[PDB]
Every structure is written in structure tokens, then in C-alpha cells.
From Swiss-Prot:
Organism of provenance: Homo sapiens
Protein function: As part of the KICSTOR complex functions in the amino acid-sensing branch of the TORC1 signaling pathway. Recruits, in an amino acid-independent manner, the GATOR1 complex to the lysosomal membranes and allows its interaction with GATOR2 and the RAG GTPases. Functions upstream of the RAG GTPases and is required to negatively regulate mTORC1 signaling in absence of amino acids. In absence of the KICSTOR complex mTORC1 is constitutively localized to the lysosome and activated. The KICSTOR complex is also probably involved in the regulation of mTORC1 by glucose.
Descriptive protein name: KICSTOR complex protein SZT2
Domain of life per record: Eukaryota
Tissue expr: Expressed in the brain, predominantly in the parietal and frontal cortex, as well as in dorsal root ganglia. Expressed in peripheral white blood cells.
Record's subcellular location: Lysosome membrane; Peroxisome
Assembly behavior: Part of the KICSTOR complex composed of KPTN, ITFG2, KICS2 and SZT2. SZT2 probably serves as a link between the other three proteins in the KICSTOR complex and mediates the direct interaction with the GATOR1 complex.
Involvement in disease: Developmental and epileptic encephalopathy 18: A severe autosomal recessive neurologic disorder characterized by lack of psychomotor development apparent from birth, dysmorphic facial features, early onset of refractory seizures, and thick corpus callosum and persistent cavum septum pellucidum on brain imaging.
């Protein structure tokens, strides 16, 4: 720990050195470190890179990279500092220069991904607790707009930053009795889905279902669009690949319906 502190002090005291590359990636904090300090510690102790082992010193909390050149990441309340030291950080002709550049790019990408994952997890937790879908979790459509501290993230991040891609998709051809439901030009599949899953329907997000997994603890969202022949075309957007809880149970329920 004293050696790591001395190395960090030496790196920070020599800006612009060709043998050092220091970058800072601020995260999109929402509730500050009150609910993120444990999350920040977990990310520091878990988020790593292939080809190396990240060891966190219990004395100071600084993370060091070991083979499985020095690279350290500081875990503060609201600031992240990366200190890199090498014999030659600009020698790309077989030296560690190109490797250091690639490592810095990968670290920046990982920091962005970690911030996005933290935002998505916060949005999912808020949706589970309050049954409300935030603007960051899903872009407000025209229909959603017509049907309608933590402000730091909203003021610093545009909508869609915490949005999650469609984890899975499904296409089922509706029968000849579901071309148009009670509404003219609109199938009854939406009405059937609403009747089936009103217990997990988002008030602020129409045709959206949020339900945390019993084991995987994955609360994803559903988007069933009338794509033509008013068939069924649904996309389940979650943090990751959902398990059997949402893979086939919903499909079987809709089939029975």
C-alpha cells in the first residue's frame, strides 16, 4: 500500500510524461455515493480485464493489476483516477506503447459500460419498487407522451443512456380471429396481454411488463408491436439474456390465452 501510494503520487506529480498515461472517466451518478459507495466497491472488486488479475489493497482500496508496467485505479466517493506507468508508453514497435494504448481504450470502454450498467440497474430497481418507468430506461414515444436528489443524472445524461437493447425477440403468427380486436384496426392481442399481465404492467409505459426473476433477479421490459395481418411481434429488453422464467413461460401463457 505505501508503494502504491508513492507510485500514484509520482505519476500524478509528472503530468504530460511520455512514460505515463492518466485518464479520468466520471460516471453518470444519480443518487451520489449514498447508494453507490457499496456499488462502487463491488465494481472495483469485480470489474476487471482479461489477461490480468485485479487485486484491491484493503489498506487504501487501490486496485493493482498482476500477471495471471503498473496500472492502478482509485476508488473515491465520486471521482475515478487511472494511473499507468511503463518503461515506454509510446513505443508501438513491439514495445508496450500499443499495448498501453489498447489497454487505455479498453479501460475507457469498460468505464462507459459500467456507468451504463449502473444506470440500467438503478432504473430497474426504481421500476420494481415504484412500478414506474423512467425516461432513461426507455425513450418516450408519441403515444407515451400523449398518455402522460436524483436530478443530476437526468440533467447530465440525455434520455436513452440507461436504455437497454432487446435481449430477446419473438414472432408468433396470430390466427384469423385476431385481425382486429374491440378497437377498429387494432388486434385483440394487446387486450389479451393486458388482461393476462395487468399485475406487472407499467403505468408510465404502455404495453410494457416488468417482473424481477425469482432466481436471476432480472426485471426486464416487454414491447409487443403490431407488425404486419395483425400478428404478434414482441421484444424483451433486459440487462442480459433472460432465463427460462421469461424465455418460455410468457410464450406458453400467450399461447394458452
Amino acid at each position: 500500500s505505501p508503494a502504491l501510494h508513492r507510485a500514484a503520487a509520482h505519476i500524478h506529480s509528472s503530468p504530460g510524461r511520455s512514460t505515463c498515461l492518466r485518464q479520468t472517466l466520471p460516471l453518470s451518478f444519480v443518487f451520489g455515493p449514498e447508494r453507490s459507495l457499496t456499488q462502487f466497491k463491488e465494481e472495483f472488486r469485480r470489474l476487471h480485464l482479461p489477461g490480468h488479475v485485479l487485486l484491491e489493497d484493503p489498506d487504501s482500496g487501490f486496485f493493482f493489476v498482476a500477471a495471471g508496467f503498473w496500472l492502478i485505479v482509485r476508488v473515491l466517493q465520486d471521482r475515478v483516477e487511472v494511473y499507468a506507468h511503463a518503461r515506454s508508453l509510446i513505443r508501438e514497435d513491439g514495445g508496450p506503447g500499443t499495448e498501453c494504448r489498447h489497454l487505455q481504450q479498453l479501460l475507457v470502454r469498460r468505464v462507459g459500460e459500467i456507468c451504463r450498467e449502473v444506470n440500467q440497474r438503478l432504473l430497474l430497481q426504481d421500476l420494481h419498487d415504484s412500478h414506474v418507468c423512467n425516461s432513461l430506461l426507455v425513450a418516450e414515444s408519441e403515444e407515451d407522451l400523449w398518455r402522460s436528489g436524483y436530478l443530476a443524472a437526468t440533467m447530465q445524461f440525455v434520455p436513452g443512456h440507461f436504455s437497454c437493447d432487446v435481449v430477446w425477440g419473438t414472432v408468433i403468427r396470430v390466427h384469423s380471429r385476431l385481425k382486429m380486436g374491440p378497437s377498429m384496426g387494432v388486434s385483440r392481442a394487446i387486450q389479451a396481454l393486458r388482461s393476462v399481465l395487468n399485475a406487472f404492467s407499467v403505468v408510465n409505459r404502455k404495453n410494457m411488463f416488468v417482473y424481477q426473476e425469482r432466481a436471476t433477479k432480472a426485471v426486464y421490459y416487454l414491447r409487443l408491436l403490431e407488425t404486419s395481418d395483425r400478428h404478434i411481434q414482441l421484444l424483451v429488453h433486459g440487462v442480459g439474456q433472460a432465463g427460462p422464467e421469461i424465455t418460455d413461460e410468457l410464450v406458453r401463457v400467450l399461447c394458452r390465452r
